[PDB]
Design a protein around this motif. Sequence first.
Motif, PDB file in Angstrom:
ATOM      1  N   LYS A 299       7.977 -30.197  24.350  1.00 25.50           N
ATOM      2  CA  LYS A 299       7.045 -31.221  23.646  1.00 25.50           C
ATOM      3  C   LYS A 299       7.832 -32.485  23.675  1.00 25.50           C
ATOM      4  O   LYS A 299       9.310 -32.594  23.439  1.00 25.50           O
ATOM      5  CB  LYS A 299       7.191 -30.578  22.249  1.00 25.50           C
ATOM      6  N   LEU A 300       7.400 -33.481  24.249  1.00 21.29           N
ATOM      7  CA  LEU A 300       7.948 -34.904  24.240  1.00 21.29           C
ATOM      8  C   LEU A 300       8.552 -35.343  23.120  1.00 21.29           C
ATOM      9  O   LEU A 300       8.065 -34.777  21.838  1.00 21.29           O
ATOM     10  CB  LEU A 300       6.827 -35.853  24.845  1.00 21.29           C
TER      11      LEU A 300
ATOM     12  N   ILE B 123      11.938 -46.405  28.349  1.00 18.13           N
ATOM     13  CA  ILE B 123      12.907 -46.186  29.446  1.00 18.13           C
ATOM     14  C   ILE B 123      11.835 -45.269  30.354  1.00 18.13           C
ATOM     15  O   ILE B 123      11.968 -45.430  31.550  1.00 18.13           O
ATOM     16  CB  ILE B 123      13.922 -45.255  29.126  1.00 18.13           C
ATOM     17  N   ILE B 124      11.340 -44.547  29.808  1.00 20.52           N
ATOM     18  CA  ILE B 124      10.394 -43.367  30.816  1.00 20.52           C
ATOM     19  C   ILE B 124       9.079 -43.908  31.024  1.00 20.52           C
ATOM     20  O   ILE B 124       8.242 -43.813  29.780  1.00 20.52           O
ATOM     21  CB  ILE B 124      10.496 -42.158  30.261  1.00 20.52           C
TER      22      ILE B 124
ATOM     23  N   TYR C 153      16.720 -40.334  31.376  1.00 18.55           N
ATOM     24  CA  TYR C 153      17.049 -40.346  30.116  1.00 18.55           C
ATOM     25  C   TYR C 153      18.206 -39.787  29.640  1.00 18.55           C
ATOM     26  O   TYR C 153      19.119 -40.640  28.921  1.00 18.55           O
ATOM     27  CB  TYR C 153      16.007 -39.978  29.295  1.00 18.55           C
ATOM     28  N   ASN C 154      18.777 -38.728  30.045  1.00 17.09           N
ATOM     29  CA  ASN C 154      19.866 -37.987  29.613  1.00 17.09           C
ATOM     30  C   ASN C 154      20.836 -38.105  30.493  1.00 17.09           C
ATOM     31  O   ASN C 154      20.919 -38.168  31.883  1.00 17.09           O
ATOM     32  CB  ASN C 154      19.341 -36.300  29.250  1.00 17.09           C
ATOM     33  N   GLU C 155      22.199 -37.928  30.127  1.00 11.49           N
ATOM     34  CA  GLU C 155      23.196 -38.181  30.907  1.00 11.49           C
ATOM     35  C   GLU C 155      23.387 -37.087  31.813  1.00 11.49           C
ATOM     36  O   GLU C 155      23.351 -35.991  31.797  1.00 11.49           O
ATOM     37  CB  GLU C 155      24.474 -38.525  30.067  1.00 11.49           C
TER      38      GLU C 155
ATOM     39  N   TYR D 108      12.316 -41.543  18.689  1.00  9.00           N
ATOM     40  CA  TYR D 108      12.927 -41.850  19.865  1.00  9.00           C
ATOM     41  C   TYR D 108      12.178 -42.857  20.511  1.00  9.00           C
ATOM     42  O   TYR D 108      11.630 -42.513  21.681  1.00  9.00           O
ATOM     43  CB  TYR D 108      13.253 -40.625  20.622  1.00  9.00           C
ATOM     44  N   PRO D 109      12.318 -44.070  19.900  1.00  9.77           N
ATOM     45  CA  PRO D 109      11.399 -45.268  20.652  1.00  9.77           C
ATOM     46  C   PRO D 109      11.924 -45.603  21.699  1.00  9.77           C
ATOM     47  O   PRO D 109      11.375 -45.999  22.886  1.00  9.77           O
ATOM     48  CB  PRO D 109      11.445 -46.218  19.704  1.00  9.77           C
ATOM     49  N   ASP D 110      13.187 -45.390  21.998  1.00 11.06           N
ATOM     50  CA  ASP D 110      14.019 -45.950  23.353  1.00 11.06           C
ATOM     51  C   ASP D 110      13.362 -45.139  24.600  1.00 11.06           C
ATOM     52  O   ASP D 110      13.034 -45.469  25.723  1.00 11.06           O
ATOM     53  CB  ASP D 110      15.501 -45.856  23.749  1.00 11.06           C
TER      54      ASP D 110
END
Length: 116
Positions: free
Chosen positions: A35-36, A48-49, A87-89, A42-44
């Motif tokens: 699920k997104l 970003i995506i 998005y994730n490092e 998590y508005p960023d």
Amino acid sequence: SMSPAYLKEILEQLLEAIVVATNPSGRLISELFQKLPSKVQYPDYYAIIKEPIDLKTIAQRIQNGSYKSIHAMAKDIDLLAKNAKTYNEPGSQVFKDANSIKKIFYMKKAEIEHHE
Ligand SMILES: Cc1cccc([C@@H]2NC(=O)c3c(Cl)cccc3N2)c1
Ligand SMILES: [Zn+2]
Ligand SMILES: [Zn+2]
């Protein structure tokens, strides 16, 4: 020329392989991708995506008949992984799980398409 019904069964098998896959610790690698993230919390993510996607959306597209080839769902799996790796490092567990999902999908796709 596969029928829609045949194609659906292949796509379901590919998704099944993804969602039952576990890490050596027993955790479902697909857990965090079902699920997104919330647009509110998590508005960023949505800044970003550019094309958000999750496994629930892919499953819906299988049920809808939106995919007309295995390739089309492969490209959505690629997008899923690319978004997580944007998005994730790098080195995050989500980053590695994204690559693992891709790895599992293409290994299963080869098993299905090449078995004789
Ligand atoms: C904020 C945060 C924290 C930890 C993990 C994620 C994770 N990152 C993804 O990119 C992703 C994708 Cl592709 C599909 C469905 C849910 C996702 N959320 C998001
Ligand atoms: Zn081949
Ligand atoms: Zn065979």
